[PDB]
Amino acid sequence: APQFFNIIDGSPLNFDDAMEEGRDTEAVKHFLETGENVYNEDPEILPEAEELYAGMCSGCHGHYAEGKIGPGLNDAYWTYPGNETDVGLFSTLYGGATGQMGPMWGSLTLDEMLRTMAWVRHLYTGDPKDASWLTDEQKAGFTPFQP
Amino acid sequence: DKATIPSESPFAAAEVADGAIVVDIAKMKYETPELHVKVGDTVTWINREAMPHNVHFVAGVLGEAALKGPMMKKEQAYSLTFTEAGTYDYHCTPHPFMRGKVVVE
Amino acid sequence: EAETQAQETQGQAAARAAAADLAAGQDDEPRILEAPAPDARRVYVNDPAHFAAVTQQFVIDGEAGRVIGMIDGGFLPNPVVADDGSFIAHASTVFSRIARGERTDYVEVFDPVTLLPTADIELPDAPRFLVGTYPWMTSLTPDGKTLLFYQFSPAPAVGVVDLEGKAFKRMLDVPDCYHIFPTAPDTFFMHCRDGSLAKVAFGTEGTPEITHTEVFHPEDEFLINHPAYSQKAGRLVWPTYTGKIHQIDLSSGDAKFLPAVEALTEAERADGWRPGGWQQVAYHRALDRIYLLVDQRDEWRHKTASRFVVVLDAKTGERLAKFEMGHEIDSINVSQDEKPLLYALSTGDKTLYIHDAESGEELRSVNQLGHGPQVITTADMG
Amino acid sequence: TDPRAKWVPQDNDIQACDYWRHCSIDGNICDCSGGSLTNCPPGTKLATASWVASCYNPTDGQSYLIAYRDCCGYNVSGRCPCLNTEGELPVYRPEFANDIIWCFGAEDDAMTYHCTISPIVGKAS
Ligand code: HEC
Ligand SMILES: [Cu+2]
Ligand code: NA
Numbered sequence: 034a035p036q037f038f039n040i041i042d043g044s045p046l047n048f049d050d051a052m053e054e055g056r057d058t059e060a061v062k063h064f065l066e067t068g069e070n071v072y073n074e075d076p077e078i079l080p081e082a083e084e085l086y087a088g089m090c091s092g093c094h095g096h097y098a099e100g101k102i103g104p105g106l107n108d109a110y111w112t113y114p115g116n117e118t119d120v121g122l123f124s125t126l127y128g129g130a131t132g133q134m135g136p137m138w139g140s141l142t143l144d145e146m147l148r149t150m151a152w153v154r155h156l157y158t159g160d161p162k163d164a165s166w167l168t169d170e171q172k173a174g175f176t177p178f179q180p
Numbered sequence: 181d182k183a184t185i186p187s188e189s190p191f192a193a194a195e196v197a198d199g200a201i202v203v204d205i206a207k208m209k210y211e212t213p214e215l216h217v218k219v220g221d222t223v224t225w226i227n228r229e230a231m232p233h234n235v236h237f238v239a240g241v242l243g244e245a246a247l248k249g250p251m252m253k254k255e256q257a258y259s260l261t262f263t264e265a266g267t268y269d270y271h272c273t274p275h276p277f278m279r280g281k282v283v284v285e
Numbered sequence: 286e287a288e289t290q291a292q293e294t295q296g297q298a299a300a301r302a303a304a305a306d307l308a309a310g311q312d313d314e315p316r317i318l319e320a321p322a323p324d325a326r327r328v329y330v331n332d333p334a335h336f337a338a339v340t341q342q343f344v345i346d347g348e349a350g351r352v353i354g355m356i357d358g359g360f361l362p363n364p365v366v367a368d369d370g371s372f373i374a375h376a377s378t379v380f381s382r383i384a385r386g387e388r389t390d391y392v393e394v395f396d397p398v399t400l401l402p403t404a405d406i407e408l409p410d411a412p413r414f415l416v417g418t419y420p421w422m423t424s425l426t427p428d429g430k431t432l433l434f435y436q437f438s439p440a441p442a443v444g445v446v447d448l449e450g451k452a453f454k455r456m457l458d459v460p461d462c463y464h465i466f467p468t469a470p471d472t473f474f475m476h477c478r479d480g481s482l483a484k485v486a487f488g489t490e491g492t493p494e495i496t497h498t499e500v501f502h503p504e505d506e507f508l509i510n511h512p513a514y515s516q517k518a519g520r521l522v523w524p525t526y527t528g529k530i531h532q533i534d535l536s537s538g539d540a541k542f543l544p545a546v547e548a549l550t551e552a553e554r555a556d557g558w559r560p561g562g563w564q565q566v567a568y569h570r571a572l573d574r575i576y577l578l579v580d581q582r583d584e585w586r587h588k589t590a591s592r593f594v595v596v597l598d599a600k601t602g603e604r605l606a607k608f609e610m611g612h613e614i615d616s617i618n619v620s621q622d623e624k625p626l627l628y629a630l631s632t633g634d635k636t637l638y639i640h641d642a643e644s645g646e647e648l649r650s651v652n653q654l655g656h657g658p659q660v661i662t663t664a665d666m667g
Numbered sequence: 668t669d670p671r672a673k674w675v676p677q678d679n680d681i682q683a684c685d686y687w688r689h690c691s692i693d694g695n696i697c698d699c700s701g702g703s704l705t706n707c708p709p710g711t712k713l714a715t716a717s718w719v720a721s722c723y724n725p726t727d728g729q730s731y732l733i734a735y736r737d738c739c740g741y742n743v744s745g746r747c748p749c750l751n752t753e754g755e756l757p758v759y760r761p762e763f764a765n766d767i768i769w770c771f772g773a774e775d776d777a778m779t780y781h782c783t784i785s786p787i788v789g790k791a792s
Contacts, residue, residue: 095213099213100209100211100212100213100214101212101213101214102212102214102215102216103212104204104211104212105209105211105212105213108206108207108209109207110204110206110207110211110228110229112204131199159207
């Protein structure tokens with residue numbers, strides 16, 4: 034089972050603060066058990082994932098996560114190294130980072146967080162071989178993002 | 181005139197004050213392209229890759245003369261304290277295609 | 286020091302005449318000669334001299350294989366020659382104390398016959414891009430009235446020099462693109478980092494019109510620094526590190542991408558053949574043929590000399606011939622007349638070998654051309 | 668030796684063109700005119716900007732990033748000339764292009780080429 038810690042102070046994340054809605058999906062259950070996000074490169078949820086990102090994240094991270102007043106999220110560099118893994122990315126969104134990048138549990142359901150995460154992974158512009166959050170099959174069909 | 185230089189030479193990133201305004205440089209880009217800060221703030225650039233980089237403001241931006249910042253090696257930092265409100269564009273000397281912007285308010 | 290068969294014949298003919306003149310009672314009355322009128326066979330060789338502070342350009346009659354004149358230049362100058370043979374010029378750089386002190390960037394224009402400068406135009410704020418000599422980093426507009434030069438730092442820009450009014454006009458801001466291919470008095474194309482071409486339309490005032498074409502090559506396909514461009518045909522011939530050739534037709538005023546062709550055969554590529562050198566490609570407008578310097582080499586030895594030249598039909602990509610040059614050749618070019626001459630310059634031998642562009646046979650050579658000759662320029666007077 | 672053959676690095680003589688750190692050097696080795704492997708000769712100006720290359724070190728089997736900074740404000744030295752292009756890309760990818768005179772940042776705006784140094788700036792790929 035994955036270890037879910039606040040990326041800043043290392044304290045255990047408290048899922049008791051999570052919204053009761055959207056904590057039951059197969060995606061969330063699978064994720065909390067394996068640390069694997071089944072929504073990655075899932076054609077069926079990407080359309081909604083894009084909308085979630087657009088309304089909640091684009092203002093600071095850019096239309097294509099290329100960065101704006103906030104840091105880019107579309108290449109292999111991460112201020113917080115753990116974000117190269119979905120367990121880490123999830124932890125960042127749930128527990129928050131610093132400054133205006135605070136916890137998202139008050140606005141997003143656990144399922145929505147996973148869907149938003151999937152869009153961030155889809156915006157990756159790096160080499161597919163470097164996308165360790167993708168399975169072999171997913172890597173085969175992945176193409177670095179381009180506007 | 182519109183900015184002061186805390187340190188003429190780059191320093192170890194470890195010396196960067198915690199919770200300081202930082203712009204990371206990696207994968208041939210300034211990770212935060214349009215940084216917004218307030219008058220008086222000190223911005224710190226930190227190179228995160230082997231490829232050397234620097235910040236360069238053409239003449240007439242921060243003063244009468246251009247400001248060719250020193251080249252930073254991996255894990256080195258360089259700071260600039262803006263004292264005047266305004267938008268300041270900059271680029272990387274050897275890599276003209278690398279551009280960034282600091283908006284002081 | 287060492288005479289080539291060509292200069293040996295010239296030296297003998299001159300001795301014969303001097304001896305006969307003396308015997309006939311003729312007196313010697315020294316004067317300053319004028320170079321013969323510019324023709325299709327005149328060829329120019331520039332010597333960057335391995336980055337020396339001062340350089341030289343040799344004016345050669347390709348038919349006789351004789352040096353008919355010279356021109357002094359500063360640090361890494363960019364030479365240009367009017368296709369109509371009305372003048373020659375270069376963008377140059379000098380310093381108050383040889384290689385240090387105050388720097389002066391300037392454009393000098395020369396009379397093609399007397400070789401005297403007819404204009405000296407200073408360029409404000411030393412804007413020249415100092416780099417190994419690339420013919421298309423400084424270009425003339427087809428009307429021959431404007432000279433355009435590239436600036437790399439602090440930002441990408443193209444300087445505009447009015448040769449007619451003998452004055453610097455202004456700097457044009459452009460995207461992250463390189464090289465300058467003029468197609469009209471007010472338009473030129475550049476090649477950009479993203480793989481597209483940029484069309485720049487400018488005027489005497491105001492910001493220029495910049496439009497991008499589609500991306501024509503991928504990130505991993507590398508286009509060499511020395512593409513061949515025929516302004517009169519509006520043809521841009523651009524080889525990649527592997528010999529694949531991209532041809533762009535700009536004769537309509539807009540970029541039209543022609544089908545790419547492989548300059549090397551399937552067997553040659555399999556045997557390790559790749560183009561290599563400085564000016565690796567040449568284009569003959571009238572015959573619509575492409576000449577490329579190639580040899581067997583490792584993938585990262587793309588700047589070494591080559592000993593072979595392959596010729597292909599630019600329209601179909603058909604292999605027409607492969608010449609064994611017999612020397613270490615760095616750069617090639619061709620005259621633009623009916624029966625073209627193939628110029629093969631050896632930086633190491635400091636010699637220009639002159640071949641028949643059809644048979645590949647070596648006709649004559651001119652040696653002692655500076656310290657490190659690299660660039661050949663010819664005019665398309667047709 | 669065939670100039671067209673694959674370049675083979677060595678780690679025993681810095682004044683030879685096949686010394687491993689010179690895998691993408693263009694010009695002259697500074698050590699031959701009063702400088703050293705990583706220092707400029709007296710009287711010249713040290714540039715800050717430069718093109719780089721990942722060079723393979725046969726001694727430890729690791730690849731290091733070399734920053735080819737030029738020593739400027741002097742006429743070319745004329746000693747120990749070398750031209751290697753391992754991983755060298757065209758001018759539109761300037762970060763790896765070596766025909767460019769990398770003198771930017773040198774004191775007194777010195778832009779003339781004298782020689783090139785081969786300092787390591789970090790580990791590569
Ligand atoms: C502006 C008010 C923001 C909004 C809305 C979102 N983010 Fe953000 N994010 C912001 C800042 C100023 C920072 C840097 C924080 C720090 O402590 O350094 C971040 C950072 C991230 C990260 C970490 C990136 C890294 O390099 O490790 C991630 C993964 C991230 N942000 C994601 C993210 C998503 C998915 C958002 C929409 C729900 C989102 N952010 C909104 C500022 C702002
Ligand atoms: Cu840079
Ligand atoms: Na990033």
